[PDB]
């Protein structure tokens, strides 16, 4: 469950 | 945050909540806001470490949305609780003016990202200042209203407009007191503004043609929340791109920066 890939990415749900 | 309503959950994962960890009876308290930038990382205000300086005064927590004031009881997944290995605060802050006011914190052990918790994004060196006009939002677990002991248990999000610096300086507004490296944001009839613990905190910015959202600030101070030509004063991410890489690496910093996608 890296913290890397495309940020500022939301409801990650 | 004085206005706006209650965000829901996922809405904002890169939002954490820096506590103060009293030793003499376990509780914690919400005092600052801060920003996600990637597993071992967190963007904040310098301020909020004042008298505070001990990385063992602190207990961070990830994938939030509810918030209990002095709390005992740990905390059950999604929602992560975390501590303070480094406090970074910027080489050439200054105190009482709150200048420079920007800060790193560096966690352990490391939050594992999923639905609820992920990065945000920071400028990108090409950006320059934030050009009003534009859409904004701010979100935080500070005071509801101007002072009121009590702060907001449930996160808040309040949509804020940018205002030009000129303006933000001019006489009838703060009359000089503000500075190339801050950002204001807020309304000339005031009403909606941040507030003491939402500090720390992002300011979101975008174009309504754009996808993403981009943390443009930090919040750090303003005479009183929500009054009338005086917006909420940010401490402009943009310019310290800079300090953040020579922190937490040039790749890292990479990783929190859009590139030049589809319009
Ligand atoms: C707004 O905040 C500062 C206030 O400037 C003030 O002066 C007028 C412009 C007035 O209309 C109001 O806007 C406000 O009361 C301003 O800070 C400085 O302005 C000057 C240029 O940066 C400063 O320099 C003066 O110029 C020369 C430089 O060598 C010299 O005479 C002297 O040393 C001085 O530097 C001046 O000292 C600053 N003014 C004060 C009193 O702080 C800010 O630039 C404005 N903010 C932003 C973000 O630009
Ligand atoms: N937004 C504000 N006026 C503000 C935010 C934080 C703070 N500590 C004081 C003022």
């Not at chain 2, 914690?28 to 300086?53: E, Q």
């Not at chain 2, 994004?121 to 320059?128: N, S, T």
């Not at chain 2, 940018?162 to 007191?177: A, H, P, Q």
């Not at chain 2, 910093?253 to 996608?261: C, D, R, S």
Request: hydrophobic letters at 35%; one cysteine or more; aromatic letters at 10%.
């Amino acid at each position: 469950a890296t913290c890397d890939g495309p940020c500022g990415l939301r409801f990650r749900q | 945050v004085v206005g706006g309503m209650s965000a829901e959950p996922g809405a904002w994962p890169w939002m954490v909540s820096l506590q103060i960890f009293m030793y003499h009876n376990n509780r914690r308290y919400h005092t600052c806001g801060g920003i996600l930038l990637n597993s071992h990382w967190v963007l904040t205000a310098a301020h909020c470490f004042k008298n505070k300086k001990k990385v063992t005064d602190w207990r961070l927590i990830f994938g939030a949305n509810e918030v209990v004031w002095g709390s005992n009881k740990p905390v059950k997944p999604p929602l992560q609780e975390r501590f303070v290995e480094e406090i970074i605060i910027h080489e050439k802050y200054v105190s009482g003016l709150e200048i420079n006011d920007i800060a790193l914190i560096k966690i352990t052990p490391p939050v594992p990202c999923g639905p609820f918790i992920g990065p945000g994004c920071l400028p990108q060196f090409k950006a320059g200042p934030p050009r009003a006009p534009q859409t904004c939002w701010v979100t935080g677990w500070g005071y509801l209203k101007e002072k009121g002991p009590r702060t907001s248990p449930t996160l808040q999000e309040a949509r804020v407009a940018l205002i030009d610096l000129e303006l933000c300086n001019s006489t009838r507004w703060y009359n000089g007191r503000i500075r190339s490296t801050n950002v204001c944001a807020g309304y000339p009839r005031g009403k909606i503004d941040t507030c003491q613990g939402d500090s720390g905190g992002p300011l979101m910015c975008r174009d309504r043609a754009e996808n993403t959202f981009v943390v443009v600030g930090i919040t750090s101070w303003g005479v009183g929340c929500a009054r009338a030509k005086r917006p909420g004063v940010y401490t402009s991410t943009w310019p310290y791109l800079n300090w953040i890489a020579s922190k937490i690496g040039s790749n890292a910093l990479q990783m929190v920066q859009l590139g030049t996608p589809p319009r």
